[PDB]
Amino acid sequence: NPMREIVVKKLCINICVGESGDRLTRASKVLEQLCEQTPVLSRARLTVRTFGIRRNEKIAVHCTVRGKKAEELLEKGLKVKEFELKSYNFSDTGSFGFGISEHIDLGIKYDPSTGIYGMDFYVVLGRRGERVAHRKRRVSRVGFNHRVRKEEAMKWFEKVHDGIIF
């Protein structure tokens, strides 16, 4: 069927830094730069003495991207990881992710003020017509065979660009 193909729904970038000061402020500037889109902050839940954080205190910053920018951002990440992944990176849901250690490598001019950060990339894949599980009116469940499974995920990956090590 023409609309049984697998497309990329969204790509989510997350930066999980500690503290709630200038480190968070600079990280937000870096993310909104690479994302050309306003990011949002996140607050903790519990209080942990070991991690030195309190409840509802600013910790991380993240954003989500859909469309062409999502596609090209994904390409840059795979280029940094030379289009090479591992077997234990794909979930049975039908998604996968990875992480770069230095934000310089993506092709961003280093600035001596912001510093160097690492980031997380997560990609969600699914067919067309999943809105039935998200619309306000007459919400239902997607069919089982229509759902995306893990085996089809790597096959999609190799099709666009191979290089998976089991």
Add this chain to the structure above:
RNA sequence: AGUUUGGCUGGGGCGGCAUAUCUGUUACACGACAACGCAGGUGUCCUAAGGCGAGCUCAGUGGGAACAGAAAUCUCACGUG
């Protein structure tokens, strides 16, 4: 000089509060029912923790992502409470 120096109570005293009151059970499938019977509360707190409209779904579990681990943040699914 005048007067007073609580009560209940398996005698009275010391102890306790069964002295004004709320929930479950004793209580015998309407209602009502005792003991110093059992297990616990009350003399406060809130300009929002009051009023309404809208949006959302909780506890938890499983699969995934640099530092990150049993436990930090992001994502998908299940989830009659």
